Amino acid sequence: PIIKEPIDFINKPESEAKEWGKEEEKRWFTKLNNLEEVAVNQLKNKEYKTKIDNFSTDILFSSLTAIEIMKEDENQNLFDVERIREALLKNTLDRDAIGYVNFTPKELGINFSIRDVELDRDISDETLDKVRQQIINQEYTKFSFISLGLNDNSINESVPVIVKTRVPTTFDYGVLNDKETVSLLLNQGFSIIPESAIITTIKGKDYILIEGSLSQELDFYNKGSEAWGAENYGDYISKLSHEQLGALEGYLHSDYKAINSYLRNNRVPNNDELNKKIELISSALSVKPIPQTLIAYRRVDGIPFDLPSDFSFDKKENGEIIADKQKLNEFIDKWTGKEIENLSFSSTSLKSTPSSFSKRRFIFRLRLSEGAIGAFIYGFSGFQDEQEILLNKNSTFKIFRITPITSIINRVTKMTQVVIDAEGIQNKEI
């Protein structure tokens, strides 16, 4: 019939983006109930939008117990997040949309400066190259709703990177605007994969312009997925030899302390019996390697970072508990880019926040890549709740981003915690 171009207001008059935004908001609101409208309308206030976005991240990393407490308490922040989600489901793109997603350098794991030269106005090719090497083909999740600014009025001149992407037709969306900006609002939990980066000058200012692909990395946050374990590891026990099964059973039930200690102590003093069991457990975990990339979680206290076990990121101010931003910055700056070893086998769960681990502040959000040696512990008596994925000994990870959050522990207790994104790298030579 007639060629369909993408929504693209870049370099068009702001008045045209604005009137499109109003028309699209009007269309969207015809599909909403009053509470949904109230929830979405409040996003007009930048303070509330920041608050709700942060809250929408916090709840992915709070226990299902804590969520249920908030629902029975009629928590308006949680209901407002649910209402926004519901409003978005009602509205789908009929064309692709091009625009700028709200990622800062810190959210791309960049803690070094970008405009390094000529009174911190210009960007060196050296720095561009450093950014390219660190971020291209890495995947950075936006835990909150993601905003797509539709024209250059959306660019914050003080933020030296711009991330441009294309949102596919059929994706759910809302429309937001203020006086000078127009944006789409998209669902929580998309990621951006930077594909290229250049230096660009816009209205006399320099930026690294990143072209990113919008993606969805498989991740069940606090909800987990027993179904994933059943689908992928239903036949797992049927594939194990009797000796493999016995060795894995032993590790899951009775031998784990001994085996963990031995491995953590570099197998000194040598112990043949443990050596044999360990060979069988690694053998078992190699029978059905992780079949596709997905996220699993492991919460720890300060000990792995050489910090006191009860290291805290919170301080008191006027009787109020708030994040200690200096500590968060110190930790993020130090640990972004560092490697984390696991000399023994290590447990992870598809659930981000099992209640019994809810007060541990250091949340490893581990990318388990296709082919990683490990197994979901499915089919094993006593392990239905845990959704455990057991990883092979010597599984080493590199942290590539650390995101502060405020986890909700219970009705009266919140805690500053950090989500530590890490990817698999070569087993540390040992």
UniProtKB/TrEMBL annotation:
Cited InterPro entries: ADP-ribosyltransferase, Binary_toxinA_clost-typ
Domain ADP ribosyltransferase: 17-211, 226-426
Any one cellular-component term (Gene Ontology): extracellular region
SUPFAM superfamilies (UniProt xref): ADP-ribosylation
CDD domains with a match to the protein in the record: VIP2
Gene3D superfamilies assigned to the protein according to its UniProt record, in alphabetical order: Toxin ADP-ribosyltransferase, Chain A, domain 1 (3.90.176.10)
Protein name: C2 toxin (Component I)
Organism of derivation: Clostridium botulinum
